[PDB]
Structures are given as C-alpha cells and as structure tokens.
Swiss-Prot record, chain A:
Identification of the protein by name: Uncharacterized protein YyaP
Transmembrane segments: 112-130
GO biological process terms held by the UniProt record: riboflavin biosynthetic process
Residue stretches in coiled coil: none
Membrane topology classification: Single-pass membrane protein
Keyword match Transmembrane: yes
Length: 177, 171
C-alpha cells in the first residue's frame, strides 16, 4: 500500500494573448480580451490553491461575480515590483524571487497561478519558472503592447497538450514546458 | 440560368510561425520548421495559380528542386518584385495582377515583402502554422503595424508534432 504521494506543484500562466504576442496593450489595454464561459476557468481555479502577484497587480486587480469568490478564496502571495526610474522599467532581484518561489514549493498544496503583472510574468518565464502556458490567443493584431515573450536567450521548446476553439475565434493552446 | 461567375481572387499567406511570432530566425533560420503531409498543402496549391516572391526569396526558393509538391509549386505563374519595397509600385503591380481571371495567389516571401503586403491591407487569408517553439529572436510576421487588425478564425488544425495551424480571414 501507499505510504506517501507527492504531486509536484506547478506554476501556471493562464492568460489572453494577441495573435502578435501581446498580453496587454502598451498603456495596459485589455479591452480586446474575451471571457468565455467554456475556457475551463472554474476548473482551472479548483486545481490551484495559490495566486502570485507583483505589488502593482495586487494593488489594482488583487482584492476586488462567482469567479471572483473563487479567485479571492485562493491564498494570495505578493512579490516586489520596484520601478527603476532610470529606464522606467521593473527591476527585480532574481535570487530573492527563486528563494521565495522555492519556500512556497516546499509547502504541501495544489497548483499556483502566476497572475501578473506583465513584467513579473516575463521574469518568471526567463527564470525558467513557468510549467504550463494556458494561452488564449485572440483573433487580433494589436501592433504594439506588452509581449508575453521578451528578452528570451535560447529557444524554449514546448509540448502542446490542449487545443480549444470558441465561437469568438479565440483558440486556447495549452503548452507544458 | 447563369451568364457570368466571379470568384474574387484571394491573396493568401501560408507559413510556419513560432509561438513568439517569428517566421524566420535572425540569420534566416528555418531549421525549426515542420512540414506535415496533413497540412492541406497539396489542396492549397491546387487552389492557387500564382506565387508572389521578392527577388531575394525567389533566388532561394523560386527554383528549388516531396519532389511532387515542388512540381506543383513550379507549375504556377510567378511574380518577382524588386527592391526597400515601395508601396505604390506593389499596389500598382497587384492591381494589374488582380485584373486577370483565375484562382488564388500565394504570397511566398520574403519577410519584408510579406510585411509590405500586410501593412497595405493586401493579405486576405493567413494560414499560420504555429510551432511549439519560442525562438527568442528573429523576423516577426507582424512588424510596424499602425492599427489593430481584426481577423475571423475559420479553421484550427492540430498535428502530432504539437504544431497548430489556425486559419484567419481579413474581412
Ligand atoms: Cl506587478
């Protein structure tokens, strides 16, 4: 008989992305994002116990119909998103990030949603910390904005696991890394 | 009874794109690109009678030697444009072309010609085979776009390689 089980915990991105690869407009526009009832978002929430936010995403989106009762039922964890006024970009200590993420992964629990904002997401991808990419690719080309993939140093090969199409023309592809 | 039919001719992109939006590496790398017999490429070729190239892209692929796919490709009429590409000249060349009767048109390459036609509102279908690869740098399919383009998704096909071809109409 079984004496122990470890299901390894996963950090998961679940987001809308444009066809030209932007998760958000250049001034934070997300009007083009489409919430569809069949995206498996309730079922995705049930598979997570934690949500990661950087300070700027937490202070805006992070504390406020039924989806929001589930969302806010999750344990919330907040990273620093210092703004460097030199170049007006987010600045992180990557060693702190890895320490904090490992401290979390040490604990028992289910999966972890990396919520935002855009700069923190990007940083997690480039630290090799995202296990699963649930990408709702919208039938729009924004022309400019905040990219999902930026400052990528080598090829990231992915495994496609799910492909889902909606009446809206949105195609969700789920990739495991 | 019928006296005339016109099927309006479509200019179509059919290419491999990475997950992060690149149709080629920095230095022209297409090593990552996957060719599947189930991509409907025989059928796409049968629906076109014309292929558009830039001079740089024609020298590379325009007379390349499945050798049965290439026999079909080479059976098409070819327009080779010269080069920057100037907007007015392409528009004029394309309007001259669209005067003629016949089937659809494959915009083949290269990256800069593809971009010229896109930003001129000249691409009607985008057959995008998205590879499960983040290339990290290269030539983007969508580069220097001045307004939102809204698309109608018409087909989504998956492959055992993890490639996903989504077909879009610019309406
Ligand atoms: Cl943030």
């Amino acid at each position: 008989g079984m004496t122990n089980n470890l299901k390894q915990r996963r950090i998961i991105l679940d987001l809308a992305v444009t066809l030209d690869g932007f998760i958000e407009g250049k001034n934070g526009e997300v009007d083009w994002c489409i919430m569809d009832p069949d995206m498996g978002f309730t079922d995705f929430l049930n598979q997570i116990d934690t949500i990661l936010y950087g300070r700027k995403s937490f202070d805006l989106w992070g504390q406020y119909k039924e989806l929001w009762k589930l969302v806010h039922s999750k344990k919330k964890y907040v990273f620093s998103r210092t703004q460097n006024e030199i170049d007006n970009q987010a600045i992180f200590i990557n060693d702190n990030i890895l320490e904090e993420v490992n401290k979390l992964k040490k604990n028992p629990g289910k999966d972890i949603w990396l919520y935002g904002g855009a700069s923190l997401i990007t940083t997690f991808i480039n630290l090799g910390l995202v296990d699963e990419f649930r990408l709702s690719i919208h039938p729009v080309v924004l022309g400019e904005g905040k990219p999902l993939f930026i400052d990528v140093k080598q090829r990231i090969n992915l495994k496609m696991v799910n492909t889902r199409t909606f009446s809206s023309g949105v195609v969700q592809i789920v990739y495991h890394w």
